[PDB]
Design a protein around this ligand. Structure first.
Ligand SMILES: *[C@@H]1O[C@H](CO)[C@@H](O[C@@H]2O[C@H](CO)[C@@H](O[C@@H]3O[C@H](CO[C@H]4O[C@H](CO[C@H]5O[C@H](CO)[C@@H](O)[C@H](O)[C@@H]5O)[C@@H](O)[C@H](O)[C@@H]4O)[C@@H](O)[C@H](O[C@H]4O[C@H](CO)[C@@H](O)[C@H](O)[C@@H]4O)[C@@H]3O)[C@H](O)[C@H]2NC(C)=O)[C@H](O)[C@H]1NC(C)=O
Ligand SMILES: *[C@@H]1O[C@H](CO)[C@@H](O[C@@H]2O[C@H](CO)[C@@H](O[C@@H]3O[C@H](CO)[C@@H](O)[C@H](O)[C@@H]3O)[C@H](O)[C@H]2NC(C)=O)[C@H](O)[C@H]1NC(C)=O
Ligand SMILES: *[C@@H]1O[C@H](CO)[C@@H](O[C@@H]2O[C@H](CO)[C@@H](O[C@@H]3O[C@H](CO)[C@@H](O)[C@H](O)[C@@H]3O)[C@H](O)[C@H]2NC(C)=O)[C@H](O)[C@H]1NC(C)=O
Ligand SMILES: *[C@@H]1O[C@H](CO)[C@@H](O[C@@H]2O[C@H](CO)[C@@H](O[C@@H]3O[C@H](CO)[C@@H](O)[C@H](O)[C@@H]3O)[C@H](O)[C@H]2NC(C)=O)[C@H](O)[C@H]1NC(C)=O
Ligand SMILES: *[C@@H]1O[C@H](CO)[C@@H](O[C@@H]2O[C@H](CO)[C@@H](O)[C@H](O)[C@H]2NC(C)=O)[C@H](O)[C@H]1NC(C)=O
Ligand SMILES: *[C@@H]1O[C@H](CO)[C@@H](O[C@@H]2O[C@H](CO)[C@@H](O)[C@H](O)[C@H]2NC(C)=O)[C@H](O)[C@H]1NC(C)=O
Ligand SMILES: *[C@@H]1O[C@H](CO)[C@@H](O[C@@H]2O[C@H](CO)[C@@H](O)[C@H](O)[C@H]2NC(C)=O)[C@H](O)[C@H]1NC(C)=O
Ligand code: NAG
Ligand code: NAG
Ligand code: NAG
Ligand code: NAG
Ligand code: NAG
Lengths: 204, 125, 213, 126, 202, 213
């Protein structure tokens, strides 16, 4: 009998999950079939994602419905005309198990304050799910000291579809403001990657 | 990290009930499909009331399983917070309506009596 | 059999801390130390023993005269939304005392909020910049948040209260330049469900001089 | 004279069930007392949903008493009009939620699965 | 055994209901006790209204809770020291079985219209039930013909706490506008008494 | 056994009338008159026979080729809110035909609203006063009401539409005095649940002259 695949894993970054698995080396070149089954579809059946493929990965971005709905993945091996048993994976929630990119930070000075722009990660901006950002943890380090800020997405006066803003008053004395920001997901609290620290200086 | 207290306990019940296997996706959805059809809070609370009553009924049958008792009553309090807004009177009135037996002869006679005044305020003001 | 109940129990709801304390119970003929058992309950729930499995700290059959729910790790303890009731009893093997039941508490409703932490003041042109940390970190800001008030006054002057403001940084604009002003920062916890507020404690007084122009 | 159609049929069921005797005043009230505590429509619809579901179950038991079938089915439609706003989908979705068996092993496992996303939107939208 | 009373009836006007009954003439003067039982009170039991009274009536304005809630009345007779069986009445809803007074109508001329004031009946005088008026049927007869108007209480622009108003345009030619108004109750559609028709001429 | 089903049934929903009609069923071998049975059903209900107890008119085993639900009394018939489904069949004793099932209808949703009745116009100074009766009497005004439109124009002029207005009396102010104006009155039934409107039929043309001053 044909051996079943082993070590099935799913890794998602920016809601683009990839399926990985390990297979033993054999004289022949085996081909695999990857099947996806989502939760929340009427009379749900396994959808073929990758068919008779020879390598150990399968990009399944097209089979992602709601990023908060569970989905299962199983894969079988074919050698010649004989197939192996399926290797089923653990349940996978894109919102829970996946990872989201960092927001893009922009900083600019004004007469009495500093306007910090927190642009949403490129996932949510493109031309009605549970999975989005509810709060932004914006860490503002002035010289040696850091204080955590919180910007809620639901605040229509502080956020819109493109960005979120934060205004911090400043003084004329020499100061070093370095800002990094991260997002928190709505249900599972999964933190996005921390933004690249952008700084600014008060020369006057 | 920072997540509502139900998340940790809900996925614990998933393992106890084996709700993580791929066979659960079959036969459509119970609640999730319907809840997306109604965005108006008046319409939402109509459906959610029956769903909340369902879970309270479900938890009542498994009140003897001491393995999950912590997770069950933790979810109940968060329901008491999210759905009833921590209003104990709202929670107790809700519990009274559910426990009414539809086969108690005394209950149905009273229900037929109050029917007129119930219909009178079914519509919004 | 029956033992004397623990004396004068107290629940410390300060900032994010949740500590239940009580006075020890002693006997005349004491051969080995007496232990205590703490239990918690929700609004309409069953009593649970306070053990590492239930609440993440082991407060059953313990020798200490206190139980710290929030000491173990961040986010540990009772959720600040919950309606939590605690009870306590002392036991020496088969003998145990009556249950001393604490009053119910919701953390947001009963907490005594402390002053803002790490207050830093930098002078400006006829103004003062105030940056500070929140009294404690709240998981869900939408359910509960802080409103801050600044009590400032010129030396020898009358009180003035600016606020409330949501940000952790504020500018005390329109001040007499090159004059000394003293300030205090005080927070206010607002819970939208209760629509009643917890008035936070004020910070220490600290005086600073504004810039020249 | 001119009165909503339920009044005529509700008092017909009142006579069939002997709901006019003085003994019904005993043992407080089922629905009328609770409904006066909640004036906000969100709170009302929470309670009314349980009350409306109660009547539909009661009527289902007496579907064989042909004496009252006229009075029963008229009130049901007026509930479909007043409570469901004549929305057939609203009426049909409501009936599915009720008919779910809480002892069906297949049903409770799906309910435990969907529990997370249900709690996610129990609170009102921002 | 002592005889039971007969023909128990309840008649209500302006939510002030009275209980009446008939009793046979006897050598002694019998005294009666009237007991009321309301729907909607916890642990409901029969409440004494009139105690050992010799005449055939009992005013129950104080025992009226919700005018839309049903109530029952039973009465027994006492002669000497022997009492009779109770005579129970049919269920009584003040909103359904009672009758309400007419609204007060006021008429006045304006430059281009006539302002008709429909004052709510004297029952709702300050001094949260189901029982109130939902529409006003205002009959306006101009010369030979009358047309029925409808004013909804829910319209905040047409009604207030004190009155409801209706403006009808008129012309300078000779015309006789006569106005009478009645109210319709919310649940049972019970019509109040028709107001005294007030007229005005141009 | 089997009989021919009634041909081309029609539901007349004009104003408050509710009449179901059909073409008669005849046979070549006809010994006695064919009877018909009308039945009605709600959104999710059981089929009822249309008899004096159910609907207040006798429409079972009737010789007529029509059935009037609203003839008996005011407000009699099916409630204008209800979702009513009708079906019909012809029968001759033990023999009966197939059920001809009509489309479901809600009275407010399929009615064809007629023009206002008893229109009376009296001239005024640069104005015209219009008093009229409602197309039909509605029991509950809160659930459904009428919105009226007046199409007025100077003779030889372009159309102008004043409305909508709730009152059964309206003043056509700001008109050229002593000039002839023609008018039409048209009602529009508004049902808040459907949030869709019923366009009423227009009334007959009638022209009137304003006053001089
Ligand atoms: C933080 O947590 C605390 C607990 O740690 C929460 O505290 C409780 O909240 C509830 C709800 O607000 C309060 O309930 C009311 O308190 C009223 C005041 O109590 C009076 O009596 C007290 C002493 O009473 C005892 O002693 C006397 C004399 O010996 C006896 O006659 C009596 O029977 C008792 O044995 C006094 O200390 C106090 O100062 C008052 O004088 C009560 O009056 C009230 O009862 C009302 O409501 C009843 C129906 O609901 C009605 O029948 C009564 O007649 C009366 O009108 C009710 O008990 C608790 O008092 C309060 N606890 C404390 C210690 O204050 C608290 O809610 C939470 N945080 C916040 C911000 O609330
Ligand atoms: C929670 O903490 C308490 C104490 O903080 C734990 O109870 C104590 O547990 C220790 C170790 O199990 C006991 O000491 C042991 O005693 C036995 C003889 O009884 C001896 O053979 C061992 O070498 C050791 O010394 C201690 O007696 C015990 N205290 C009491 C009052 O029973 C408790 O187990 C903790 N609970 C959990 C769930 O971890
Ligand atoms: C049955 O008993 C009740 C209660 O006594 C009677 O109700 C009373 O009715 C009067 C008249 O409508 C109310 O008005 C009163 O008017 C006088 C002056 O006209 C004024 O001095 C009073 O202060 C009051 O405003 C009165 O409020 C009301 N209540 C009482 C206590 O009198 C009712 O009339 C009785 N039924 C019959 C048929 O008599
Ligand atoms: C509803 O109306 C129909 C007719 O409009 C009624 O059916 C008809 O009823 C009459 C009187 O009962 C029948 O006439 C009688 O016939 C018998 C012999 O069958 C004769 O002995 C009597 O003297 C009288 O002439 C008529 O035949 C009958 N039609 C049919 C087709 O059966 C019907 O009864 C009415 N329903 C109700 C509930 O009132
Ligand atoms: C897996 O495949 C999806 C689908 O092609 C990739 O998403 C694409 O990303 C590129 C880069 O921005 C876009 O040009 C395409 O329009 C996207 N396609 C769709 C359908 O959205 C995804 O990047 C792939 N992941 C990896 C790791 O290669
Ligand atoms: C919070 O939960 C506690 C525990 O059930 C409630 O306290 C009881 O409340 C009932 C009804 O008000 C009283 O009859 C009991 O005497 C209370 N017990 C104690 C020990 O006080 C409390 O009412 C709840 N509060 C809220 C706001 O939900
Ligand atoms: C009015 O009631 C009728 C009777 O049930 C409804 O008719 C059915 O509605 C369902 C759902 O829309 C359809 O699947 C069926 O095919 C319908 N049957 C027929 C014969 O058409 C009708 O939908 C109801 N309308 C409203 C708006 O509630
Ligand atoms: C009301 O409840 C009491 C208490 O059990 C019972 O004795 C009585 O028979 C009940 N009556 C009705 C009509 O339900
Ligand atoms: C779903 O439906 C199928 C087909 O009737 C049935 O065999 C199965 O038990 C049902 N339950 C689940 C959880 O799929
Ligand atoms: C009671 O009223 C009825 C009519 O309702 C009348 O016929 C009768 O004579 C009256 N008296 C008695 C004792 O029934
Ligand atoms: C007459 O015969 C035809 C078949 O030729 C049949 O369809 C019809 O129902 C018959 N009618 C009677 C009354 O026998
Ligand atoms: C009534 O209108 C509804 C809605 O457009 C339609 O579905 C139905 O077929 C109509 N009924 C008739 C009898 O024309």
């Amino acid at each position: 009998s044909v051996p079943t695949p082993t070590n099935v894993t799913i890794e998602s970054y920016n809601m683009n999950p990839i399926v990985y698995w390990e297979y033993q080396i054999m004289p022949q070149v085996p081909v695999f079939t990857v099947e996806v089954k989502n939760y929340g579809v009427k009379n749900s059946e396994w959808i073929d994602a990758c068919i008779n493929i020879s390598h150990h990965y399968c990009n399944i971005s097209d089979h992602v419905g709601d990023p908060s709905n569970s989905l299962w993945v199983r894969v079988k091996a074919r050698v010649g005309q004989k197939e192996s048993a399926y290797a089923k994976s653990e349940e996978f929630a894109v919102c829970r198990d996946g990872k989201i990119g960092p927001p893009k930070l922009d900083i600019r000075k004004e007469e009495k304050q500093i306007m910090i722009d927190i642009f949403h990660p490129s996932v949510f901006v493109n031309g009605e799910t549970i999975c989005y950002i509810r709060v932004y943890n914006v860490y503002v380090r002035k010289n040696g000291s850091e204080i955590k800020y919180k910007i809620l997405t639901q605040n229509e006066d502080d956020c819109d579809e493109i960005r979120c803003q934060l205004a911090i008053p400043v003084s004329s004395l020499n100061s070093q403001y370095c800002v990094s920001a991260e997002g928190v997901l709505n249900v599972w609290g999964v933190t996005t990657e921390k933004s690249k620290e952008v700084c600014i200086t008060i020369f006057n | 990290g920072s997540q509502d207290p139900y998340v940790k306990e809900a996925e614990n019940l998933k393992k106890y009930f084996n709700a993580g296997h791929s066979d659960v996706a079959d036969n459509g959805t119970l609640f999730l499909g319907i809840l997306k059809n109604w965005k108006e809070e008046s319409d939402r609370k109509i459906m959610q009331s029956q769903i909340v009553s369902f879970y309270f009924k479900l938890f009542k049958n498994f009140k003897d399983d001491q393995s999950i008792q912590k997770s069950v009553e933790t979810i109940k309090e968060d329901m008491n917070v999210k759905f009833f807004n921590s209003n104990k009177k709202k929670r107790d009135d809700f519990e009274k309506l559910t426990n009414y037996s539809v086969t108690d002869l005394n209950v149905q006679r009273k229900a037929i009596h109050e029917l007129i005044q119930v219909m009178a305020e079914l519509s919004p003001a | 059999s029956q033992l004397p109940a623990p004396q004068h129990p107290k629940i410390r709801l300060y900032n994010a801390e949740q500590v239940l304390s009580w006075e020890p119970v002693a006997l005349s003929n004491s051969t080995r130390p007496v232990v205590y058992q703490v239990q918690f309950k929700y609004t309409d729930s069953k009593w649970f023993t306070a053990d590492i499995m239930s609440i993440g700290v082991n407060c059953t059959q313990i020798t200490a005269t206190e139980c710290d729910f929030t000491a173990a790790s961040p986010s540990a303890g009772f959720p600040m939304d919950f309606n939590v009731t605690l009870r306590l009893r002392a036991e020496l093997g088969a003998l145990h005392s009556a249950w001393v039941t604490m009053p119910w508490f919701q953390h947001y409703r009963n907490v005594t909020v402390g002053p803002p932490e790490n207050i830093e003041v930098t002078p400006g042109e006829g103004s003062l910049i105030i940056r500070f940390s929140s009294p404690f970190d709240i998981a869900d800001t939408s359910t509960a948040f802080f409103c801050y008030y600044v009590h400032y006054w010129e030396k020898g002057g009358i009180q003035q209260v600016k606020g409330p403001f949501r940000s952790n940084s504020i500018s005390l604009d329109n001040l007499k330049p090159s004059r000394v002003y003293c300030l205090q920062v005080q927070a206010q916890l607002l819970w939208n469900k209760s629509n009643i507020f917890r008035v936070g404690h004020l910070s220490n007084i600290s005086c600073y001089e504004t810039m020249a122009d």
